[PDB]
């Protein structure tokens, strides 16, 4: 955590205090797909020639 604080204000020694940082982020553990049960095939040969 100190590294971001040091490079945020563009110095090396920073005066005593508290400074804003980034916020906690959560990486998605899964990426699911949810589609209805559809098996029918669109007839496009009748649509094209």
């Amino acid at each position: 955590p100190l590294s971001e604080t040091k490079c945020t204000l563009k110095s090396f020694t920073v005066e005593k205090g508290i400074y804003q940082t980034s916020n906690f982020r959560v990486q998605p553990t899964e990426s699911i797909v949810r589609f209805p049960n559809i098996t029918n095939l669109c007839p496009f040969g009748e649509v094209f020639n």
């Binding site: 095939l41 669109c42 007839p43 496009f44 040969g45 009748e46």
Partner: protein, 230 residues
């Protein structure tokens, strides 16, 4: 119009060769289907002829060095130079179709649907020579005349080898025609039948012509079927 027609039938002797043909009509063979199913009545079958053009390694480990065949796409006809024909290949083949996966018929799926066939040809590989069929007019009897429906025909007997095709009145008689398949004699001869149920009032007044055709022997007999006129 779209039809698979077999052609190029003739007599084959042991040590000879012959060029069969399956011609597609309507659809060009350049981008169409051809599956050569070999059928022997009563038992299992087998698909053998492995010719998908481009000439690479695709063959079945049963007919190595026997069945040779060529490709001709623009003429819409394929020829089968079936060399080294064995005498134990008595079967009538059929060139047919299939289904793959590309076009609108399949977007998701597998395919494999033989759906359009030919009519087949009758080629017999026999060591002995061909013999002209004998046509014997089976005349109506008194019971057939008095029974309302007369039964008449012409027996094809003692012809070797196959085939014999029987037609009635050069295609002018179709109702009641029923063809009884050939019999396998103990000596190897064949005998078939063709009976048409006709009105009894048409006996004598209406001529009954049976056309018997044998292509390997190239004999056509236009036999007259007449009643018993003693």
């Amino acid at each position: 119009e779209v039809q698979l027609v077999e052609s190029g039938g003739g007599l084959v002797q042991p040590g000879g060769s012959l060029r069969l043909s399956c011609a597609a009509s309507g659809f060009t063979v350049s981008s169409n289907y051809m599956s050569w199913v070999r059928q022997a009545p009563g038992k299992g079958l087998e698909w053998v002829s492995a010719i998908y053009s481009g000439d690479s390694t695709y063959y079945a480990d049963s007919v190595k060095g026997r069945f040779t065949i060529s490709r001709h796409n623009p003429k819409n006809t394929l020829y089968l130079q079936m060399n080294s024909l064995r005498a134990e290949d008595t079967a009538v083949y059929y060139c047919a179709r299939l289904v793959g996966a590309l076009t609108n018929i399949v977007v998701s799926g597998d395919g494999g649907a033989f759906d359009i066939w030919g009519q087949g040809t009758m080629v017999t590989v026999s060591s002995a020579s061909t013999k002209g069929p004998s046509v014997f007019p089976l005349a109506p009897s008194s019971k057939s005349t008095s029974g309302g429906t007369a039964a008449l025909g012409c027996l094809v007997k003692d012809y070797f080898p196959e085939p014999v095709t029987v037609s009635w009145n050069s295609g002018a008689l179709t109702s009641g025609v029923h063809t009884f398949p050939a019999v396998l004699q103990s000596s190897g001869l064949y005998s078939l039948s063709s009976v048409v149920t006709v009105p009894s009032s048409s006996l004598g007044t209406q001529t009954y012509i049976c056309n018997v055709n044998h292509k390997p022997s190239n004999t056509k007999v236009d036999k007259r079927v007449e009643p018993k006129s003693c």
